[PDB]
């Protein structure tokens, strides 16, 4: 369907899949670009992972005797994005970002040149030397991106809470008082015990729009299909705030309160027909 001639007898066949889960609050909008180059002994599939992962930030009362003045805020300490395969006929040959990146904006490029030559740059706009290129772009204010796992069969990134701008200066993501505030009075409302939306950055208030790449490599002549899974999700922390009329607001953190709240989708690539299917 979408075929681009990239020079020197090579082409890129472009496929997409959009898979969402209202249960997990995730949309996977994935691009799968097959590199078809007679001068490269392997097939290659550039997978660009975009979409949305809801923050799932929420605020609630804590029920039970003794918890009448205790409220909770559930919020994402880390966003999880990963692609894994167990198929012996496929391996991961590059990934972007390749290293830890702490800047608010992340913008990088993967280039391809005929003959099986990949190159990555941690910037967008550098040189018109590639036969084909694909970029990633995302914003992660107050968060940092780390490569949690990387090997020939899997890659996992974590976009993790780091440092926040707060009325009392910068606060570490591990500060138990992060997002905690005194409510106006004793008149309920769990929401009032925590920083208002205007103090919460987009990754806390709304969610994250991922933009990550990995390239799958397949020996030409090995089996026609491979399966792999893409996982998008979050790890949530809980901050509890308890109002003590005489000693003020007391805060506690349950770190890694809900881990790997992820939506996993299994895809099948057919290297012979240059097609992608969702298995479930």
């Amino acid at each position: 369907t979408n075929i681009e001639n990239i020079g020197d007898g090579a082409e890129v066949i472009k496929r997409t899949e959009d898979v969402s889960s209202k249960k997990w609050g995730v949309t996977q909008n994935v691009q799968f670009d097959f590199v078809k180059d007679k001068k490269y002994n392997k097939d290659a599939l550039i997978v660009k992972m975009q979409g949305f992962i809801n923050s799932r930030t929420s605020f609630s009362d804590v029920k039970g005797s003794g918890y009448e003045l205790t409220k909770r805020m559930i919020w994402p300490f880390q966003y999880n994005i990963g692609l894994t395969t167990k198929d012996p006929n496929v391996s991961l040959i590059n990934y972007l970002p390749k290293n830890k990146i702490e800047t608010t904006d992340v913008g990088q490029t993967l280039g391809y040149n005929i003959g099986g030559n990949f190159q990555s740059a941690p910037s967008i706009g550098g040189n018109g030397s590639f036969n084909y290129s694909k970029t990633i772009s995302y914003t992660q204010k107050s968060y940092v991106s780390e490569v949690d796992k990387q090997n020939s069969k899997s890659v996992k990134w974590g976009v993790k809470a780091n440092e926040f701008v707060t009325p009392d200066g910068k606060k570490s993501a591990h500060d138990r008082y992060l997002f905690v505030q005194s409510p106006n009075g004793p008149t309920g409302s769990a929401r009032e015990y925590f920083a208002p939306d205007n103090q919460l950055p987009p990754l806390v208030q709304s969610g994250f729009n991922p933009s990550f790449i990995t390239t799958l490599s397949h020996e030409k002549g090995s089996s026609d299909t491979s399966e792999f899974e893409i996982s998008y999700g979050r790890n949530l922390d809980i901050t509890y705030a308890t109002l003590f009329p005489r000693t003020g607001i007391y805060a506690e953190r349950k770190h890694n309160a809900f881990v790997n709240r992820n939506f996993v989708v299994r895809y099948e690539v057919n290297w012979k027909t240059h097609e992608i299917k969702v298995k479930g």
């Binding site: 930030t57 929420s58 605020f59 609630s60 009362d61 804590v62 029920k63 039970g64 909770r72 769990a190």
Partner: peptide, 8 residues
């Protein structure tokens, strides 16, 4: 239960 309804 242990907690109240989830507020956005």
């Amino acid at each position: 239960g242990d907690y109240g309804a989830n507020l956005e």
